[PDB]
Amino acid sequence: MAVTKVTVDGIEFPPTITPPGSSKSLTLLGAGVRGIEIETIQIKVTAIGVYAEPEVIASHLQKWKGKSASELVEDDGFFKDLVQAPVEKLAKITIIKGLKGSQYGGAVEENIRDRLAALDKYSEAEEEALEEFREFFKTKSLPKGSVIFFHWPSPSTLQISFSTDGSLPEEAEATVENANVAAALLDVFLGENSVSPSTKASVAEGISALL
Numbered sequence: 001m002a003v004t005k006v007t008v009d010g011i012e013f014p015p016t017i018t019p020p021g022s023s024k025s026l027t028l029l030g031a032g033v034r035g036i037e038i039e040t041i042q043i044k045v046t047a048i049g050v051y052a053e054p055e056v057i058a059s060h061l062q063k064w065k066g067k068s069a070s071e072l073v074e075d076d077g078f079f080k081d082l083v084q085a086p087v088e089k090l091a092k093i094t095i096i097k098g099l100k101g102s103q104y105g106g107a108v109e110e111n112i113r114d115r116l117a118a119l120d121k122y123s124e125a126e127e128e129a130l131e132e133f134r135e136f137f138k139t140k141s142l143p144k145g146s147v148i149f150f151h152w153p154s155p156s157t158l159q160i161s162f163s164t165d166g167s168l169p170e171e172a173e174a175t176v177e178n179a180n181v182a183a184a185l186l187d188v189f190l191g192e193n194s195v196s197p198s199t200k201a202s203v204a205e206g207i208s209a210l211l
Protein backbone atom coordinates (compact mmCIF):
# COMPACT_ATOMS: atom_id res chain seq x y z
CA MET A 1 0.00 0.00 0.00
CA ALA A 2 1.06 3.54 -0.87
CA VAL A 3 2.18 6.17 1.65
CA THR A 4 2.98 9.87 1.36
CA LYS A 5 6.22 10.95 3.03
CA VAL A 6 8.14 14.17 3.54
CA THR A 7 11.92 13.77 3.65
CA VAL A 8 15.05 15.88 3.95
CA ASP A 9 17.90 13.89 2.41
CA GLY A 10 16.05 10.73 3.43
CA ILE A 11 15.29 11.91 6.97
CA GLU A 12 11.54 11.51 7.41
CA PHE A 13 9.40 14.32 8.85
CA PRO A 14 5.71 13.68 9.60
CA PRO A 15 3.26 15.96 7.76
CA THR A 16 1.62 16.90 11.05
CA ILE A 17 2.58 16.65 14.71
CA THR A 18 1.05 17.14 18.16
CA PRO A 19 3.47 18.85 20.57
CA PRO A 20 4.20 17.19 23.97
CA GLY A 21 1.35 17.97 26.37
CA SER A 22 -0.57 19.85 23.70
CA SER A 23 -4.04 19.21 22.30
CA LYS A 24 -3.55 20.99 18.98
CA SER A 25 -2.16 19.42 15.82
CA LEU A 26 0.35 21.44 13.81
CA THR A 27 1.14 21.19 10.11
CA LEU A 28 4.60 21.03 8.60
CA LEU A 29 5.40 24.28 6.77
CA GLY A 30 8.87 23.30 5.62
CA ALA A 31 12.11 21.61 6.56
CA GLY A 32 15.81 21.98 5.89
CA VAL A 33 19.24 21.23 7.33
CA ARG A 34 21.86 22.90 9.42
CA GLY A 35 25.19 22.43 7.83
CA ILE A 36 28.57 23.26 9.29
CA GLU A 37 31.38 24.00 6.83
CA ILE A 38 35.04 23.15 7.21
CA GLU A 39 37.23 24.28 4.34
CA THR A 40 35.25 23.24 1.22
CA ILE A 41 33.84 20.23 3.07
CA GLN A 42 30.21 20.54 4.16
CA ILE A 43 28.88 18.52 7.09
CA LYS A 44 25.16 18.26 7.78
CA VAL A 45 24.60 17.98 11.54
CA THR A 46 20.83 18.35 11.95
CA ALA A 47 17.57 18.30 10.04
CA ILE A 48 15.02 20.94 11.03
CA GLY A 49 11.26 20.81 10.46
CA VAL A 50 9.02 23.82 11.12
CA TYR A 51 5.36 23.31 12.12
CA ALA A 52 2.44 25.70 12.81
CA GLU A 53 -1.38 26.04 12.66
CA PRO A 54 -1.88 26.48 8.89
CA GLU A 55 -5.20 28.42 8.60
CA VAL A 56 -4.42 30.69 11.54
CA ILE A 57 -0.91 31.60 10.46
CA ALA A 58 -2.20 32.02 6.90
CA SER A 59 -4.73 34.50 8.32
CA HIS A 60 -2.01 36.39 10.25
CA LEU A 61 0.22 36.55 7.14
CA GLN A 62 -2.54 37.51 4.71
CA LYS A 63 -0.70 40.68 3.66
CA TRP A 64 1.73 38.30 1.90
CA LYS A 65 -0.92 36.51 -0.18
CA GLY A 66 0.13 35.68 -3.74
CA LYS A 67 3.72 36.69 -2.97
CA SER A 68 6.03 34.08 -4.49
CA ALA A 69 8.36 31.75 -2.57
CA SER A 70 11.17 33.53 -4.40
CA GLU A 71 9.93 36.89 -3.11
CA LEU A 72 9.30 35.79 0.49
CA VAL A 73 12.76 34.33 1.15
CA GLU A 74 14.24 37.57 -0.21
CA ASP A 75 12.30 39.58 2.40
CA ASP A 76 13.39 39.84 6.05
CA GLY A 77 10.08 41.50 6.95
CA PHE A 78 8.09 38.39 6.06
CA PHE A 79 10.25 36.34 8.40
CA LYS A 80 9.89 38.98 11.10
CA ASP A 81 6.12 38.61 10.68
CA LEU A 82 6.40 34.80 10.73
CA VAL A 83 8.50 34.93 13.93
CA GLN A 84 6.09 37.44 15.52
CA ALA A 85 2.89 35.67 14.45
CA PRO A 86 0.87 34.72 17.57
CA VAL A 87 0.23 31.08 16.69
CA GLU A 88 1.51 27.80 18.07
CA LYS A 89 4.78 26.78 16.45
CA LEU A 90 7.09 23.78 16.72
CA ALA A 91 10.61 23.00 15.55
CA LYS A 92 11.46 19.30 15.20
CA ILE A 93 15.23 18.80 15.19
CA THR A 94 16.66 15.45 14.13
CA ILE A 95 20.34 14.88 14.86
CA ILE A 96 22.33 13.77 11.82
CA LYS A 97 25.85 13.77 13.28
CA GLY A 98 25.89 12.80 16.95
CA LEU A 99 27.24 15.19 19.56
CA LYS A 100 27.05 15.96 23.27
CA GLY A 101 24.21 18.08 24.61
CA SER A 102 26.40 20.75 26.20
CA GLN A 103 27.90 21.39 22.77
CA TYR A 104 24.58 21.97 20.95
CA GLY A 105 23.13 23.84 23.90
CA GLY A 106 26.28 25.92 24.35
CA ALA A 107 26.37 27.00 20.71
CA VAL A 108 22.65 27.81 20.50
CA GLU A 109 22.75 29.73 23.78
CA GLU A 110 25.69 31.80 22.55
CA ASN A 111 23.76 32.55 19.36
CA ILE A 112 20.74 33.70 21.40
CA ARG A 113 22.81 35.85 23.75
CA ASP A 114 24.49 37.43 20.75
CA ARG A 115 21.12 38.32 19.22
CA LEU A 116 19.67 39.66 22.50
CA ALA A 117 22.77 41.59 23.56
CA ALA A 118 22.75 43.18 20.11
CA LEU A 119 19.13 44.22 20.80
CA ASP A 120 19.91 45.52 24.31
CA LYS A 121 17.45 42.93 25.66
CA TYR A 122 19.70 40.84 27.88
CA SER A 123 19.24 41.10 31.64
CA GLU A 124 19.19 38.73 34.59
CA ALA A 125 15.84 37.23 33.56
CA GLU A 126 17.29 36.19 30.22
CA GLU A 127 20.44 34.85 31.91
CA GLU A 128 18.28 32.71 34.19
CA ALA A 129 16.13 31.52 31.28
CA LEU A 130 19.31 30.55 29.43
CA GLU A 131 20.53 28.92 32.64
CA GLU A 132 17.46 26.66 32.41
CA PHE A 133 18.04 26.10 28.69
CA ARG A 134 21.72 25.32 29.37
CA GLU A 135 21.00 22.95 32.24
CA PHE A 136 18.52 21.05 30.05
CA PHE A 137 21.20 20.12 27.53
CA LYS A 138 24.07 19.79 30.02
CA THR A 139 22.96 16.34 31.18
CA LYS A 140 22.10 14.82 27.79
CA SER A 141 23.73 13.02 24.86
CA LEU A 142 22.58 13.73 21.30
CA PRO A 143 23.33 10.66 19.16
CA LYS A 144 22.37 10.28 15.49
CA GLY A 145 18.59 9.85 15.23
CA SER A 146 17.73 11.45 18.56
CA VAL A 147 15.26 14.34 18.31
CA ILE A 148 14.81 17.69 20.03
CA PHE A 149 11.36 19.32 20.21
CA PHE A 150 11.17 23.12 20.52
CA HIS A 151 7.57 24.14 21.17
CA TRP A 152 6.26 27.73 21.08
CA PRO A 153 2.63 27.55 22.30
CA SER A 154 2.87 31.33 22.22
CA PRO A 155 5.64 33.74 21.16
CA SER A 156 6.54 34.34 24.84
CA THR A 157 6.92 30.74 26.08
CA LEU A 158 9.32 27.96 25.09
CA GLN A 159 8.83 24.28 25.94
CA ILE A 160 11.62 21.80 25.29
CA SER A 161 11.42 18.03 24.90
CA PHE A 162 13.86 15.34 23.79
CA SER A 163 13.80 11.69 22.75
CA THR A 164 16.94 9.60 22.25
CA ASP A 165 15.16 7.15 19.92
CA GLY A 166 13.22 9.71 17.88
CA SER A 167 9.76 8.98 19.27
CA LEU A 168 7.26 11.67 20.31
CA PRO A 169 6.93 12.55 24.02
CA GLU A 170 3.42 13.18 25.41
CA GLU A 171 4.54 15.92 27.81
CA ALA A 172 7.25 18.59 27.82
CA GLU A 173 10.38 18.25 29.96
CA ALA A 174 11.31 21.91 30.36
CA THR A 175 9.48 25.23 30.33
CA VAL A 176 11.29 28.53 29.72
CA GLU A 177 8.98 31.50 30.25
CA ASN A 178 10.93 34.41 28.79
CA ALA A 179 9.69 36.24 25.71
CA ASN A 180 13.12 37.40 24.59
CA VAL A 181 14.82 33.99 24.72
CA ALA A 182 11.76 32.28 23.19
CA ALA A 183 11.67 34.73 20.26
CA ALA A 184 15.47 34.79 19.87
CA LEU A 185 15.58 30.99 19.62
CA LEU A 186 13.07 31.19 16.77
CA ASP A 187 15.22 33.91 15.29
CA VAL A 188 18.21 31.54 15.34
CA PHE A 189 16.37 29.45 12.71
CA LEU A 190 14.15 31.91 10.79
CA GLY A 191 16.04 35.16 11.41
CA GLU A 192 18.48 37.28 9.41
CA ASN A 193 21.70 35.27 9.96
CA SER A 194 19.96 31.90 10.05
CA VAL A 195 21.86 28.74 10.85
CA SER A 196 19.69 27.21 8.11
CA PRO A 197 18.84 29.17 4.95
CA SER A 198 17.57 25.93 3.44
CA THR A 199 14.97 25.56 6.18
CA LYS A 200 13.91 29.15 5.58
CA ALA A 201 13.61 28.44 1.85
CA SER A 202 11.49 25.36 2.56
CA VAL A 203 9.25 27.27 4.98
CA ALA A 204 9.05 30.15 2.48
CA GLU A 205 7.82 27.91 -0.35
CA GLY A 206 5.47 26.09 2.03
CA ILE A 207 3.92 29.32 3.30
CA SER A 208 3.81 30.75 -0.22
CA ALA A 209 1.88 27.64 -1.25
CA LEU A 210 -0.30 27.89 1.86
CA LEU A 211 -1.43 31.39 0.77
Ligand SMILES: [Cl-]
Nearest residue numbers: 034046048093
Ligand atom coordinates in the same frame (compact mmCIF):
# COMPACT_ATOMS: atom_id res chain seq x y z
CL1 LIG B 1 19.91 22.86 14.74
